[PDB]
Amino acid sequence: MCLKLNLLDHVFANPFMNAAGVLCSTEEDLRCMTASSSGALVSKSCTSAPRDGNPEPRYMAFPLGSINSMGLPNLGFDFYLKYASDLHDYSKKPLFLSISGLSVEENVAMVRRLAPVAQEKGVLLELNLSCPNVPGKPQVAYDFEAMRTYLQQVSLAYGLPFGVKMPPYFDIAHFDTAAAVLNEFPLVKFVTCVNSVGNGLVIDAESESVVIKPKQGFGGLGGKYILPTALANVNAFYRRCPDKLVFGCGGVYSGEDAFLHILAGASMVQVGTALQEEGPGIFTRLEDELLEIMARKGYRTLEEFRGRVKTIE
Amino acid sequence: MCLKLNLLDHVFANPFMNAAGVLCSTEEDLRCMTASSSGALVSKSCTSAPRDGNPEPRYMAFPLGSINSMGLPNLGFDFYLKYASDLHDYSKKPLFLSISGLSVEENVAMVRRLAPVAQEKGVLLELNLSCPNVPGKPQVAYDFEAMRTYLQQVSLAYGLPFGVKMPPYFDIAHFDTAAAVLNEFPLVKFVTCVNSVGNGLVIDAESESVVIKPKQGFGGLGGKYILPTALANVNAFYRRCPDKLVFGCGGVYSGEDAFLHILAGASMVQVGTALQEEGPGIFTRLEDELLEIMARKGYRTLEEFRGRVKTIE
Ligand SMILES: Cc1cc2nc3c(=O)[nH]c(=O)nc-3n(C[C@H](O)[C@H](O)[C@H](O)COP(=O)(O)O)c2cc1C
Ligand SMILES: Cc1cc2nc3c(=O)[nH]c(=O)nc-3n(C[C@H](O)[C@H](O)[C@H](O)COP(=O)(O)O)c2cc1C
Ligand SMILES: COc1ccc2cc(CCc3c(C(=O)O)[nH]c(=O)[nH]c3=O)c(OC)cc2c1
Ligand SMILES: COc1ccc2cc(CCc3c(C(=O)O)[nH]c(=O)[nH]c3=O)c(OC)cc2c1
Numbered sequence: 001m002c003l004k005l006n007l008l009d010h011v012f013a014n015p016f017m018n019a020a021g022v023l024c025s026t027e028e029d030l031r032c033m034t035a036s037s038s039g040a041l042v043s044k045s046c047t048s049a050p051r052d053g054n055p056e057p058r059y060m061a062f063p064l065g066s067i068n069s070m071g072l073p074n075l076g077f078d079f080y081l082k083y084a085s086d087l088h089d090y091s092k093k094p095l096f097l098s099i100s101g102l103s104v105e106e107n108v109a110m111v112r113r114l115a116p117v118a119q120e121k122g123v124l125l126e127l128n129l130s131c132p133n134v135p136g137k138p139q140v141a142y143d144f145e146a147m148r149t150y151l152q153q154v155s156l157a158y159g160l161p162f163g164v165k166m167p168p169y170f171d172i173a174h175f176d177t178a179a180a181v182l183n184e185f186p187l188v189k190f191v192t193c194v195n196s197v198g199n200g201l202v203i204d205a206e207s208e209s210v211v212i213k214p215k216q217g218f219g220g221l222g223g224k225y226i227l228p229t230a231l232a233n234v235n236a237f238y239r240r241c242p243d244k245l246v247f248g249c250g251g252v253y254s255g256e257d258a259f260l261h262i263l264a265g266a267s268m269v270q271v272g273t274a275l276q277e278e279g280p281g282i283f284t285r286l287e288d289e290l291l292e293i294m295a296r297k298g299y300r301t302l303e304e305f306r307g308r309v310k311t312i313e
Numbered sequence: 314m315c316l317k318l319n320l321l322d323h324v325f326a327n328p329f330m331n332a333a334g335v336l337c338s339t340e341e342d343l344r345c346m347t348a349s350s351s352g353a354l355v356s357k358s359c360t361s362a363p364r365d366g367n368p369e370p371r372y373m374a375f376p377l378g379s380i381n382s383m384g385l386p387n388l389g390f391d392f393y394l395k396y397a398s399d400l401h402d403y404s405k406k407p408l409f410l411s412i413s414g415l416s417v418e419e420n421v422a423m424v425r426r427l428a429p430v431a432q433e434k435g436v437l438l439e440l441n442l443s444c445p446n447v448p449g450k451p452q453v454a455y456d457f458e459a460m461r462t463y464l465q466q467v468s469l470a471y472g473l474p475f476g477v478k479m480p481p482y483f484d485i486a487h488f489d490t491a492a493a494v495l496n497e498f499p500l501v502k503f504v505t506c507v508n509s510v511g512n513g514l515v516i517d518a519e520s521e522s523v524v525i526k527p528k529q530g531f532g533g534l535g536g537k538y539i540l541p542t543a544l545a546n547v548n549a550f551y552r553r554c555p556d557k558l559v560f561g562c563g564g565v566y567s568g569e570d571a572f573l574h575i576l577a578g579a580s581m582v583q584v585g586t587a588l589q590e591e592g593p594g595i596f597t598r599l600e601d602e603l604l605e606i607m608a609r610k611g612y613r614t615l616e617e618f619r620g621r622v623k624t625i626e
Contacts (some may be wrong), residue, residue: 001618055626057625064377093342127584132484133486135485136485136486136489138486138487139484139486142484142486167483169512170455170480170481170484170510170511171452171512172531173449173451174455175452175512197483198483199482199483199484199485199488199549200541200544200545201541201544201548203576204624205569205606206575208576208618208621208622208623209622209623209624209625210622210623210624210625213624213625213626215624216548216624217622218485218549219361224377224540225537225538225539226538228514228515228534228538229510229513229534229538231513231514231515232512232513232514234482234510235514235529247322259518260516264516289360291343293518309516309521309523310521311523311530312370312522312523312526312530313368313526
């Protein structure tokens with residue numbers, strides 16, 4: 001028994017991959033993720049030019065999860081495109097490239113350049129719709145008209161299947177509106193639910209201080225804190241987008257957590273905080289644990305249980 | 314060293330109280346909360362007419378928190394008004410009455426009625442804005458136009474200081490907008506942050522099933538899952554509403570968690586999931602734990618550290 005699957009016209013050894021932003025950023029990180037047992041890897045979300053990011057400390061982790069205000073530190077789009085085009089060994093596993101321009105024009109400029117590398121090499125685009133915006137305006141995924149603009153412009157500029165990285169939603173009418181936007185776009189083939197839960201605040205009692213420097217300590221939450229949020233979003237999109245795949249991300253520390261994501265509807269399962277904390281060895285543990293639970297249940301394939309979470313009466 | 318507070322023209326032995334919905338719904342519950350060591354109590358959010366609420370099971374708890382889709386089961390306004398007017402012993406502690414009408418007209422009808430009892434007996438109103446409006450629209454506090462409407466009508470109808478119970482927000486633009494709406498209403502003297510984190514989904518791995526019956530398993534989250542969200546919201550409103558009090562609610566299981574709330578800016582601290590799980594003996598434990606932290610740090614009163622939290626740089 002093995003966990004191999006086929007999606008998006010690619011073959012994957014297993015459904016696991018890093019979450020964007022974790023273990024990705026440099027050529028070394030990417031080489032490390034490729035060497036791991038993961039089924040796939042995604043690069044750090046990038047901007048057209050390189051970015052330092054926000055001041056440090058900007059990440060901290062704790063038993064229940066993590067908080068970050070990284071600020072999109074990245075090597076710039078030319079580096080990630082070069083990685084995709086010249087450096088990555090596609091024979092090892094698929095590559096996704098995450099783009100997170102600060103405007104629609106920036107995203108369009110990057111995707112036009114990605115397109116021929118996607119066609120030639122099969123790199124897959126994940127468009128990050130979870131960046132914050134400037135005072136007086138919510139992030140793009142929380143502004144449905146802007147989101148529709150982004151997706152119209154990218155779909156036209158790119159012209160090939162792609163996916164979108166979504167922030168969590170908390171209200172059923174928002175699930176209905178956001179899924180309806182997404183379903184206007186046939187090139188949107190996967191939806192990754194979820195990004196970090198926005199603008200949490202971790203305080204240390206002993207020091208009486210926030211734990212990260214940027215934004216007066218406010219930053220995105222990941223890890224155990226966010227597992228039921230992540231599962232809700234996975235399942236809500238899985239129900240509303242029958243012609244798309246849903247990729248689960250949030251709160252995965254074990255094969256049991258991966259199992260729950262898949263029961264909710266996840267095709268691939270991304271690991272952020274736990275991978276940052278445990279390192280890439282985690283992927284062999286997750287595979288083993290997921291196969292153990294499958295064996296105890298009598299499941300031979302992921303398809304047997306994906307999306308088959310039971311409701312009560 | 315002491316936990317005593319004096320706010321809203323009342324005196325409180327300590328900052329702790331139940332969160333609305335927990336251990337409030339019946340006369341029995343209200344007498345129990347009154348007999349406890351809490352500094353205050355709040356009654357179950359009510360509607361004009363009694364409600365049975367949603368089908369069971371509709372609450373479940375786990376090590377990291379709870380999920381609920383109670384559906385506003387309550388004995389109706391007239392009961393809670395009677396409790397406030399005839400049964401509550403104000404010599405023991407102050408009472409808050411929470412309302413959660415299904416429309417702006419329902420809320421106005423109740424606050425019109427409540428006003429003379431508020432004036433005579435000193436019951437305090439908490440208006441629940443994290444509550445349903447028209448189905449297929451977001452809850453009231455995620456629809457800033459509806460939220461302004463509700464506060465305008467209630468302010469006119471009631472004419473006395475009140476407070477509001479808010480859902481959590483996740484986007485700085487939402488903090489800015491929501492706070493600005495609140496600051497339009499001088500009668501809004503306290504803001505309680507936060508209600509449950511909406512539409513989470515808990516899945517049991519062994520049974521492969523959601524754990525509550527309503528809404529295909531989706532419900533609001535409380536407990537350890539939500540503490541950094543709660544803190545962020547307390548602090549965000551504390552900073553943006555300098556002429557209001559902020560009450561904190563979310564993730565309180567210990568005096569340390571309460572301390573963090575208070576450092577974020579909280580003036581009362583409400584206890585939901587942990588109280589549901591441990592019972593009213595929690596209040597003596599939280600009091601002792603909070604006093605211990607104060608003793609170790611040399612703080613003699615709550616005002617010495619309320620809203621202090623340090624930022625980096
Ligand atoms: C340090 C760090 C950096 C991240 N950077 C990005 C990013 O560049 N792009 C992105 O889509 N998400 C980014 N995220 C979000 C993660 O991809 C993931 O959505 C979130 O951490 C929740 O998953 P988890 O519970 O496994 O951590 C980042 C998360 C962390 C912790
Ligand atoms: C069983 C249950 C019932 C609740 N009912 C209400 C309610 O009637 N009105 C309200 O404002 N909040 C209600 N809430 C939300 C709690 O007041 C509180 O905001 C939330 O549970 C977060 O606090 P916690 O982390 O201490 O549980 C309810 C919560 C629970 C668990
Ligand atoms: C406060 O200064 C900033 C500046 C840029 C930001 C960019 C993003 C998008 C990248 C990203 C980041 C990040 O690089 O901080 N962290 C996440 O948890 N998810 C993300 O998707 C972002 O995502 C939540 C937050 C950012 C915050
Ligand atoms: C039929 O589905 C319903 C019906 C009524 C609802 C009423 C509320 C408001 C009361 C409330 C409830 C509740 O009574 O269900 N639970 C919470 O965690 N916070 C609350 O404020 C509510 O709060 C989210 C959710 C409700 C869901």
